[PDB]
Structure 1
């Protein structure tokens, strides 16, 4: 390569738009990254609300450090972070606080055209969307395809929680055995786009309208359909859907697939274990969803759930991987942000 990455001693200043579940957890992880520092947060509320929500967290625990509210922001372990309440990305003066890269984590500007509103005079230089960002934006799952970045990009995508879970599992199947086709079901924690109790859903979804913590709720997901953005050779081969269920975080992805090469359960499991790294984990323990809350793997393969069914010479393969849709995704997002910040030019 010729990427001439900055050292982690060269601290890149970052902005967060949307201090929500992903925004706040990203902020937490950035405290333990040497070369990245958050100097500006933009949301729709006062500093006290945001400071309180950083300090206390229902699913991810108390903040590791001190948080203290101040005029126009709050201090985190002594260091001041500016807070603003600007509804339009175009009006945020990111350059005032030295911000080069924005984490776009509101859920309202997840496209090239909308995210580009952050890039203007007195604005930011680059934007990382914390969600799928359309087919014209480079979409990175860290340790699967982050080598597609050269640092000249203005808008990139960190993909979805489900994509970060599925990608290394699907890639391992492809590289070892060849994937012909497959169908995915993710059994997913409820999220902030569902209603706490039955009521009109602003996006017109009749199922997200329903009480999220009291129902099994079917819903759509693009993670299988858009896997070609991450793994080109799987383009058009996967499709899927979700069943959202009453846990506040923690999810699992099942993939049923046909393969080119013949396999046994043992060979499938061995292939996953050999593909394991900081992003893709491996376990043979019979765990449940609470055991993956707060993990740093993007995807945790569960060898206890593997199936290989051969009937009349035709085989279906089932592979299953866990993910904390909050912290698993956030860990991948911050790995990508850190890498992008180093090569940004």
Structure 2
């Protein structure tokens, strides 16, 4: 009884932080009827933003036309406004008809700080493109978007790694039950790393290092905070990251103990059965470049599955790919579209 809108009823969106996720989100929204970006806010002039939309190192040239104008740029004819406002509270989203804001700066990933968008002459609601702590409903599309009723003011699209891990973990539990698990994600370097060795503004002595010239260990909360997405796994998973020199493209390895004894084929079959728009399945021996730009939020790879049986005991290894950029963004926009229809 959620009374969703048709794709003909156009919900106007604003993007805060026209960065990697911001710009790719924008690109995907071009092919989503009933969702339209009318305003972008960042920290720079429209010329910079127009150029970065047209040309993209890892995701290819923009499919369309982009022409710069005063206070914005035109995309296939349609003007989009550009503002350069550091404070979310100072952004007059309402003037451009924006109901929902994509918070994609990385600096306001908190209920308190995201709410700052909602005010007189501002936006109605906000989707954070990152974990927003617990306090905020955290959604991995096609895993737990049940949880949305449309009354929420602030929601999170979770992290890149969470959207990869969730379907894979859920499938495991639903079929065999998960006792505990440790995760490693071999991850592309990202914009929060230094291009060369230098002082890291967040105090991280590893993200301080040249990201495109090192294997760089780093912490991730995605495994710990999986309880926010699959409640019956709360406190059962932990993990970490190894950041490596590819500009996008990642993979998540999970090592787990299960309640049921399993064989490799049963695991792969279970994953194949769980496949959908969000969770893909493959038996081809692919590498990271092969998953750049894919629209699955997670792509299980059967060729890497391991089931080790020593004495009575079993360790199970399951691996899924994800383009930390497009995989996440695809999920984000699915979630945004659904949230826009259901919005109160």
Alignment RMSD (CA, Å)? 0.2
Render the CA deviation track for 1:69-101: whole Å, top value 9, x for unaligned. 001000000000000000000000000000000
Structure 2 length normalisation: TM-score?
1.00
Q: CA deviation at 1:26?
A: 0.1
Render the CA deviation track for 1:276-325: whole Å, top value 9, x for unaligned. 00000000000000000000000000000000000010000000000000
Q: CA deviation at 1:240?
A: 0.1
Separation in structure 2 between the aligned mates of residue 4 and residue 65 of structure 1, nearest angstrom: 34
Q: CA deviation at 1:17?
A: 0.2
Q: CA deviation at 1:52?
A: 0.1
Partner of 1:261: 260
Render the CA deviation track for 1:151-170: whole Å, top value 9, x for unaligned. 00000000000000000000
Paired residues in the alignment total 344
Separation in structure 1 between the aligned mates of residue 237 and residue 71 of structure 2, nearest angstrom: 47
Partner of 1:147: 146
Q: CA deviation at 1:37?
A: 0.1
Q: CA deviation at 1:343?
A: 0.3
What secondary structure is seen at the aligned counterpart in 1 of 2:155?
A: strand
Q: CA deviation at 1:134?
A: 0.6
Separation in structure 2 between the aligned mates of residue 35 and residue 237 of structure 1, nearest angstrom: 39
Q: CA deviation at 1:139?
A: 0.1
What secondary structure is seen at the aligned counterpart in 2 of 1:26?
A: helix
Q: CA deviation at 1:47?
A: 0.3
Partner of 1:131: 130
Q: CA deviation at 1:149?
A: 0.2
Q: CA deviation at 1:199?
A: 0.2
Q: CA deviation at 1:107?
A: 0.1
Partner of 1:196: 195
Separation in structure 2 between the aligned mates of residue 240 and residue 87 of structure 1, nearest angstrom: 34
Render the CA deviation track for 1:86-131: whole Å, top value 9, x for unaligned. 0000000000000000000000000000000000000000000000
Partner of 1:60: 59
What secondary structure is seen at the aligned counterpart in 1 of 2:224?
A: coil
What secondary structure is seen at the aligned counterpart in 1 of 2:44?
A: coil
Separation in structure 2 between the aligned mates of residue 86 and residue 307 of structure 1, nearest angstrom: 50
Where does the alignment leave 5 or more consecutive residues of structure 1 unmatched?
A: none
Separation in structure 2 between the aligned mates of residue 38 and residue 24 of structure 1, nearest angstrom: 11
Separation in structure 2 between the aligned mates of residue 150 and residue 51 of structure 1, nearest angstrom: 35
Partner of 1:174: 173
Task: Give runs of ≥4 in structure 1 deviating > 4 Å.
Answer: none
Pairing of 1:146-295 with structure 2 (within 5 A): 146-295=145-294
Separation in structure 1 between the aligned mates of residue 332 and residue 53 of structure 2, nearest angstrom: 18
Partner of 2:79: 80
Structure 1 length normalisation: TM-score?
1.00
Separation in structure 1 between the aligned mates of residue 144 and residue 77 of structure 2, nearest angstrom: 37
Separation in structure 1 between the aligned mates of residue 180 and residue 140 of structure 2, nearest angstrom: 21
Q: CA deviation at 1:225?
A: 0.2
Separation in structure 2 between the aligned mates of residue 326 and residue 54 of structure 1, nearest angstrom: 14
Where does the alignment leave 5 or more consecutive residues of structure 2 unmatched?
A: none
